[PDB]
Design a protein around this ligand. Structure first.
Ligand code: MG
Ligand code: ZN
Ligand code: ZN
Ligand code: ZN
Ligand code: ZN
Lengths: 98, 258, 378, 66, 59, 51, 103, 152, 115, 47, 202, 95
RNA sequence: UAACCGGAGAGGGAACCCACU
């Protein structure tokens, strides 16, 4: 039930302390058009909260070349925080340093 | 004040399109004839579908829409029928509609192409264009899927729905060379010659003609298979003539009553 | 077509086009997106011309005859889920046709439209406030059925009955609704040119070339100069060359082998103005319009923001329980908020009577008694 | 899903030309010569067969029975 | 009332040859929700013919 | 200071150059939904009788 | 009792039967059961493939042929266009295209 | 009816309009009213409020009606003007070399409301009657106005 | 849901008059003919025929709203010619033109076929 | 005397399900099943 | 001010209706033919941009040689940045101006700019001649990586295209590096819009 | 038995793995589905990638809005231990 | 020297995410 709950509501934590957890980590897949499903499956998310008057975390840094799409961002209040992988960007899965 | 004297000269006549030139007529008349070619030419087309059973991957409304767009050979029956909304009968009758039937089931292993060969008709002269070249595909069925429906085709014209449009494309054109300067080219030499340009390859556009009206309106009426391409023109002229006659009768009634 | 098995999916809010088309000018990297196998849009003959003033201020004119031929026609699927349950010792929820002879709480709906099982049948023309799932809860019994959302108006597509984890009867019903593109529907291009369908003309009324080629969509020229979507013009120019060549052009971003002049050189080999313009004839009078119109195939999309899913009106509808004001939202038959900024807008107007009406008389009028000397709220 | 019966812009019947177009492309035809042979002159009608994607072939893979 | 909720066929006027179910009927007119279009029209009650939908045999 | 009000409608706006600058083209269902309370008078008793 | 005399592979239980047979073969540590399951799965796969090819024998085989031919023709068209590019290397003078030349 | 776009930033965001019922399902409004509401037609939505009394309808008609809101106290200038497409069209229309024949003038005059019913003397009588663009546009300017402006 | 039925562009309702004449008061010998359920197809030809009449001072037409099916033709003739008969003659001779065109097309067709 | 016939899923065999019955196919076992098309009059004015 | 508000009401409607009905005869459009610049103006554009690039190179040489004199108020590095920005602003403005005078009377960008309906001469400059310098926070593109703006450039490269100066036009297309720099420049507009909306309403 | 774990579609532990194109259609599914999402109560859920600061790395920032001239942050994290990441701070005072 | 029926609105909530101008 703990898995099934955190994956259903999106709150990353326990149900007794849900208001203290993260939110929106697990979202309903967007089956509206294939290009929306694919883009929802390769979506990044900077956890910086909204109501933020700062601009540096929202700006397209030079170092996002080839990793993050420099054009696909929401135009609302999440502009620059929600991102998208470039086509040939691969995220390392990890290995033992031994 | 009185009537100008229009002429006609058919340059190409096939069973699929007609190219003719109208001379000595006003632009408004020659363009209204074009508009009547598209909208106000009656034609028989499926406009009512009762689906007995449908198991195809196409939706019930998809089948109805596709059946609506199949052209039916209306050449002499169309001038006999009564408009559906103006007929006295309850439901449908031969005077105001052509019955159609399509009962199909796929049992063979290979997929069934539900073309227009499967549209049965209660009359021999009004059918999908199959007389004399593949046929319009309505549905594709797998093993165990079916389509069974009754349909009626009503007398209509392209002003209500595009299914009653008897033309593929009407190519209306006048004054090929820019003699009247009705259009201004920023660079006249970048523009290809019209098909009817009585102009050598040296000059770009005809020298300006200050006093001159548009005549010699070049048409290319292409049928969709329903009406023969000359019957389209004949019936369009008849229909515009009849619109004007009816309006004149109503105007006389308005005048005598004032 | 958002997925090839969309007929098995009992999704909430699915949209699929009747005749989606592959883009005539594509990038080489949309092959790996699988976009030519599940495309979203139709190549349309766009004419970038200010015609008759409705193709105006981000709006677009559309060819009504093209729509009649299935242009951008789409079907809208909505799914309703319901589950029976054991409410308690005394009360049980079950699917049965609500019946005034034994059920209380019945309403003005036509309950004859759904079968004895308690579920509407596949292929039944439903409408707003029609009963979709005949649930009854025994207390004799209270009609707790589920009704089609007000002003949805579709035809039941398929009805599935099964069990859930708890072994209770559980049905997901979905209703299809064909959506012809009317005026007010939102259409966009592949370059950021969003626009609503301003008005629809028949083929006889649209402008036409030297042959009977009329636009499917007419878009305002004033959309280009400030937004500088020159890629829209280059696409509208190369789609013509792709439709004449008879094979699909390339629009990879940084090609260096596809510049405007080479496309124009190709386009002039098929008997067209090398820059894409054409001599249109006014659809109303048949006279040539003195400016040669830019025209060509352009891959236009149909966005999900259809007007009939946004038109909303109210006149003394339901009311909230705590503060007896109109409900909120279109689905609840709520009323629009007369926010504070509107209050200030009316204050600046000096229209104190309209302000009073809006904030007191059309929202929540009430009366109380009060003492003339000491008592408060008697 | 399936080839449109008529060209959206013109009105010319293109519903009986998808299979013939596929056959001509089964031959070594260049993609434009097939349209030219099918009597499609206007580019509005040519785009109907150029851009069409036949999904009804993919939907028929979900056999109801057998 | 009497024919509310029944399937009718509009047998006259512009909406000839249309099937729908009567949403509300009065002594003069009736509101038929058309089966094909997504609309409810108000037709006169003499323009209508009841078609019904029943199955015989029941055994 | 801010409430929800009866007799209000919301819809997508679209251009119409044929309307006068002081005219708004409402659709037919919105006009057929909301009402205006009108007093009866010997002046307009027949119009409202027919309505 | 119905499944007793009615064959399992009729008609839509094929893929589910394939998965169940693979699970049964995997769950058994005995070689005889594994071999019997392998033979049964091979026979069922052959029968199902024959049935699927028979159904797709018409109207879907054709478009698969023309799709393989389309992509093959495209890989041929690309290389012939590339040889044309290599051949047309006489003079490239058109203006409207540029590239960076810093430093 | 009084008509609003929810970002009601200034007084001209809630101007009052006369209603006309039209077939399709959208709030159609004149182009020139775009600038007051800052409301393009890419999908924008606006709220319609219907007053519910004579004392309120009269107040709206006499205080908030659209033509009474042409000039704004914010900057003493108009806020509604000939804008967007019709401005380019009118610039091209008023060029010195725009000439029209009787058949086009008599069609354009059909769209003037305050036309006095008299066709003005064409600017060119021979070799052929031709009307200059300014000649037709002078019929649209009301009354006897006197102003001097400079083209861009 | 608010889409008008397509038959409303040519089918008259009950009570509507096909054509309605109103005398214009702002100038003498001027009328306004209001045709219901018509469009540029029938207004344009009438107008263009009226401009060939030498006794017609003014002729013009409009479609007041593209969503409404009605045209307003305005005629103004000389004092010795009422616009009623101007309009009537401009429809009569227009019908004659179209009938002549029908006849000449019909003969040219049979001359083209095996000829 | 109509028993409310359903169509199975994986089976596609018509089953007779009355009230107070478990939704399972008469053969092979299936908890998913759909409903048959209506017998009401389906008429589309094709447009 | 002279007539009432009703006569002006009819004035507005009459202008719209009469002019839009004439627009059915005149017609109006925009297309690729309005962006092409006749191949004579392209030579001027290229020459101006190349001379600007050479001037920037000379300024860089002077700075590296410590020959660049600090202008009043500004420091050495700040005056170098001001010099480069001044030179590239001159380049963009001059190329745009040359583009303006090359447009034919029938050019549909000019018809929409001189009417004032939509667009500005800067949009014509960017579409036809050159897009220009892309700034973020008022400065040229910053060294996001270690002493360079992208991996494709070399450390300590202050040249035009190394720091964001877009030298192509929207008709000729953007080189990938300057495409990314243009995206960086354009993100500022979206961020500022999203924060302005919430900051001014309060 | 410990409990149920939700499986992401088209993973190495989904029934829809390494499966051919005939079989995906036989199971009424599409061969174009990318996978990568969970089914939770019949709803397709996607885990959106969350970015953070890289652990076990030194960062020297300069917070001007405090008493410190510099701050050598280091978010240390051994490896997915039951102890969440802990951070050192070797800062320098302003004076 | 006679004539059968009368009942009316079922009335619901927080949070988070996504999206639109
Ligand atoms: Mg907008
Ligand atoms: Zn009949
Ligand atoms: Zn008291
Ligand atoms: Zn076509
Ligand atoms: Zn079972």
């Amino acid at each position: 039930d703990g898995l099934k709950y955190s994956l259903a509501t999106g709150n990353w934590g326990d149900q007794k302390k849900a208001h203290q957890a993260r939110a929106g980590v697990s979202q309903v897949l967007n089956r509206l058009t294939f290009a929306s499903t694919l883009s929802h499956l390769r979506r990044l998310n900077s956890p910086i909260g909204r109501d933020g008057k700062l601009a540096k975390p929202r700006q397209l840094h030079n170092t996002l070349w080839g990793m993050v799409c420099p054009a696909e961002t929401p135009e609302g209040h999440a502009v620059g925080l929600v991102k998208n992988l470039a086509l040939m960007a691969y995220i390392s899965v990890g290995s033992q340093p031994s | 004040p009185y009537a100008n004297q229009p002429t006609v000269r058919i340059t190409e006549l096939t069973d699929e399109n007609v190219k003719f030139i109208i001379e000595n007529t006003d632009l408004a008349v020659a363009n209204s004839i074009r508009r009547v070619f598209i909208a106000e030419v009656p034609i028989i087309a499926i406009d009512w579908v009762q689906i007995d059973a449908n198991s195809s991957v196409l939706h019930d409304e998809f089948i109805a829409h596709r059946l609506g767009l199949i052209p039916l050979t209306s050449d002499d029956i169309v001038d006999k029928l009564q408009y559906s909304r103006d007929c006295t009968c309850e439901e449908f009758c031969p005077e105001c509609s052509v019955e159609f039937t399509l009962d199909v089931r796929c049992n063979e292993d290979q997929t069934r192409h539900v073309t227009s060969r499967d549209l049965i008709s209660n009359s021999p002269r009004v059918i999908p264009v199959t007389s004399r070249q593949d046929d319009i595909l309505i549905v594709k069925l797998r093993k165990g899927q079916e389509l069974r429906l009754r349909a009626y085709a009503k007398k209509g014209f392209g002003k209500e729905h595009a299914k009653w449009n008897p033309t593929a494309g009407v190519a209306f054109e006048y004054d090929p060379d820019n003699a009247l300067r009705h259009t201004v080219y920023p660079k006249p030499e970048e523009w290809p010659k019209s098909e009817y340009s009585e102009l050598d390859e040296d000059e770009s556009q005809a020298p300006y003609d200050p006093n001159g009206k548009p005549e010699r309106f070049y048409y290319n009426v292409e049928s969709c298979g329903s009406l023969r391409p000359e019957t389209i023109v004949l019936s369009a002229l008849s229909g515009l003539k009849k619109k004007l006659s009816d309006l004149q009768t109503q105007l006389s009634h308005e005048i005598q009553s004032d | 077509v958002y997925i090839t098995n969309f007929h098995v999916r009992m999704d909430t809010l699915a949209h699929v086009l009747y005749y989606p088309q592959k883009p005539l000018v594509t990038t080489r990297s949309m092959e790996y997106l699988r976009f030519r196998e599940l495309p979203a849009g139709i190549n349309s003959i766009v004419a970038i011309a200010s015609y008759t003033g409705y193709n105006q201020e981000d709006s677009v004119i559309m060819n009504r005859s093209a729509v009649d031929r299935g242009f951008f026609r789409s079907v809208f699927y909505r799914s309703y889920k319901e589950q029976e349950s054991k409410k308690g010792f005394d009360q049980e929820e079950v699917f049965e046709k609500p019946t005034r002879e034994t059920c209380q709480g019945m309403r003005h709906a036509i309950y004859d439209k759904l079968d004895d099982d308690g579920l509407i049948a596949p292929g039944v023309r439903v409408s707003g406030d029609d009963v979709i799932i005949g649930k009854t809860v025994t207390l004799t019994k209270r009609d707790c059925s589920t009704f089609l959302r007000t002003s949805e108006t579709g035809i039941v597509d398929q009805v599935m009955v099964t069990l859930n984890q708890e072994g209770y009867k559980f049905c997901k019903i979905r209703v299809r609704s064909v959506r012809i593109p009317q005026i007010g529907d939102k259409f966009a291009s592949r370059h950021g040119q969003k626009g609503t369908c301003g008005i629809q003309y028949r083929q006889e009324d649209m402008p036409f070339t030297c042959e009977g080629i009329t636009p499917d969509i007419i878009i305002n020229p004033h959309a280009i100069p400030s937004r500088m979507t020159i890629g829209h013009l280059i696409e509208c120019l190369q789609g013509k060359v792709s439709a004449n060549k008879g094979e699909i052009g390339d629009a990879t971003p940084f090609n260096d082998a596809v510049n405007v002049q080479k496309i124009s050189n190709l386009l002039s080999d098929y008997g067209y103005h090398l820059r894409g313009n054409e001599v249109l004839y006014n659809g109303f009078t048949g006279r040539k319009i003195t400016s040669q119109i830019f025209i060509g195939p352009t891959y236009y999309q149909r966005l999900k923001h259809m007007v009939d899913d946004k038109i909303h009106s109210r006149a003394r509808g339901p009311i909230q329980i705590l503060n007896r004001q109109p409900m909120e939202g279109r689905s609840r038959d709520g009323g629009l908020r007369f926010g504070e900024m509107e209050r200030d807008c009316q204050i600046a107007h000096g229209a104190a009577q309209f302000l009073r009406e809006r904030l007191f008389e059309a929202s929540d009028p009430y009366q109380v008694h009060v003492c003339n000397l000491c008592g408060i709220m008697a | 899903m399936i080839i449109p019966v008529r060209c959206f812009t013109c009105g010319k019947i293109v519903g009986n030309k998808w299979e013939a177009y596929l056959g001509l492309l089964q031959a070594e035809y260049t993609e434009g010569d097939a349209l030219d042979a099918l009597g499609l002159k206007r580019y509005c009608c040519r785009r109907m067969l150029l851009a069409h994607v036949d999904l009804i072939e993919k939907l028929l893979n979900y056999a109801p029975l057998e | 009332n009497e024919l509310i909720g029944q399937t009718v066929r509009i047998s006259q006027g512009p909406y000839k040859g249309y099937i729908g179910v009567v949403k509300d009927a009065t002594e003069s007119t009736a509101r038929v929700e058309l089966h094909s279009t997504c609309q409810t029209i108000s037709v006169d009650r003499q323009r209508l013919t009841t078609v019904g939908s029943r199955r015989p045999g029941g055994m | 200071m801010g409430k929800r009000v009866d007799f209000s409608a919301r819809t997508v706006i679209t251009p119409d150059p044929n309307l006068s600058i002081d005219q708004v083209g409402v659709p037919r269902s919105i006009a057929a939904n909301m009402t205006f309370a009108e007093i009866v008078t010997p002046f307009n008793i027949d119009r409202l009788q027919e309505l | 009792e119905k499944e007793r005399f009615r064959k399992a592979p009729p008609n839509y239980a094929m893929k589910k039967t394939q998965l169940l047979k693979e699970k049964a073969m995997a769950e058994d540590l005995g070689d005889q059961d594994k071999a019997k399951q392998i033979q049964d799965q091979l026979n069922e796969l052959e029968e199902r493939a024959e049935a699927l090819d028979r159904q797709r024998t018409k109207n879907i085989s054709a478009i698969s042929y023309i799709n393989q031919r389309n992509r093959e023709w495209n890989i041929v068209e690309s290389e012939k266009a590339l040889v044309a590019e290599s051949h047309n290397m006489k003079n490239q003078q058109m203006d409207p295209f540029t590239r960076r030349q810093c430093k | 009816v009084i008509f609003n776009r929810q970002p009601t930033l200034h007084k001209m965001s809630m101007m009052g309009h006369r209603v006309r019922i039209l077939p399709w399902s959208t709030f159609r409004l004149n182009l020139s009213v775009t600038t007051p509401y800052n409301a393009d037609f890419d999908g924008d939505e606006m709220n319609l409020h219907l007053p519910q009394s004579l004392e309120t309808r009269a107040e709206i008609q006499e205080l908030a009606m659209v033509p009474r809101m042409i000039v704004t106290p914010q900057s003493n200038r108009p806020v509604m003007g000939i804008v967007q497409d019709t401005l380019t069209a009118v610039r091209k229309f008023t060029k010195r070399d725009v000439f029209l024949e009787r058949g086009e003038v008599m069609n354009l005059l059909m769209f003037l409301s305050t036309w006095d019913g008299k066709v003005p003397q064409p600017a060119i009588l021979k070799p052929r009657p031709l009307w200059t663009g300014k000649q037709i546009f002078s019929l649209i300017i009301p009354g006897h106005i006197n102003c001097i402006r400079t083209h861009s | 849901m608010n889409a008008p039925p397509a038959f409303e562009s040519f089918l008259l309702f009950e009570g509507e008059k096909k054509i309605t004449i109103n005398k214009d008061t702002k100038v003498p010998n001027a009328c306004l003919f209001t045709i219901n359920k018509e469009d540029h197809t029938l207004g344009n030809i009438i107008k263009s025929q009226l401009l060939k009449d030498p006794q017609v001072l003014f002729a013009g037409y409009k479609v007041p709203h593209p969503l409404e099916h009605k045209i307003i033709i305005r005629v103004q003739t000389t004092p010795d010619y009422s616009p009623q008969e101007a309009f009537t003659n401009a429809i009569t001779d227009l019908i004659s033109e179209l009938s002549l065109l029908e006849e000449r097309f019909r003969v040219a067709i049979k001359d083209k076929q095996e000829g | 005397q109509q028993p409310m016939i359903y169509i199975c899923g994986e089976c596609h065999t018509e089953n007779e399900i009355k009230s107070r019955d478990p939704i399972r196919c008469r053969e092979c076992g299936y908890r998913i099943m759909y409903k048959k098309r209506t017998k009401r009059l389906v008429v589309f004015d094709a447009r | 001010l002279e007539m009432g508000h009703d006569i002006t009401r009819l004035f507005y409607s009459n202008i719209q209706t009469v002019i839009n009905n004439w627009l059915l005869i005149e017609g109006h459009t925009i297309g690729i033919g309005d962006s092409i610049a006749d191949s004579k103006t392209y030579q001027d554009i290229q020459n101006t941009i190349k001379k600007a690039k050479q001037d920037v190179i000379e300024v860089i040489e002077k700075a590296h040689n410590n020959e660049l004199e600090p202008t009043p108020g500004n420091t050495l590095r700040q005056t170098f940045e001001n010099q480069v920005n001044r030179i590239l602003n001159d380049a963009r403005d001059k190329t745009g101006s040359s583009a303006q005078k090359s447009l034919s009377e029938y050019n549909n960008f000019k018809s929409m700019v001189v009417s004032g309906a939509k667009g500005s001469k800067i949009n014509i400059s960017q579409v036809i001649a050159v897009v220009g310098q892309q700034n973020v926070e008022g400065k040229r593109i910053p060294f996001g990586f270690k002493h360079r703006t992208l991996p494709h450039f070399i450390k300590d490269d202050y040249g035009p295209e190394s720091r964001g100066f877009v030298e192509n036009s929207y008709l000729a297309g953007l080189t990938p590096t300057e495409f990314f720099f243009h995206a960086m420049g354009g993100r500022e507009g979206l961020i500022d819009t999203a924060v302005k909306t919430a900051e001014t309403g309060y | 038995f410990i409990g149920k774990i939700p499986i992401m579609l088209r993973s190495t532990y989904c029934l829809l793995n390494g499966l051919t194109d005939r079989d995906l259609c036989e199971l009424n599914e599409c061969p174009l589905d990318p996978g990568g999402y969970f089914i939770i109560n019949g709803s397709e859920k996607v885990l959106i990638a969350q970015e953070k600061m890289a652990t076990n790395t030194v960062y020297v920032f300069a917070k001007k809005d405090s008493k410190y001239a510099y701050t050598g942050e280091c978010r240390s994290c051994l490896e997915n231990s039951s102890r969440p990441t802990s951070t050192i701070w070797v800062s320098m005072l302003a004076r």
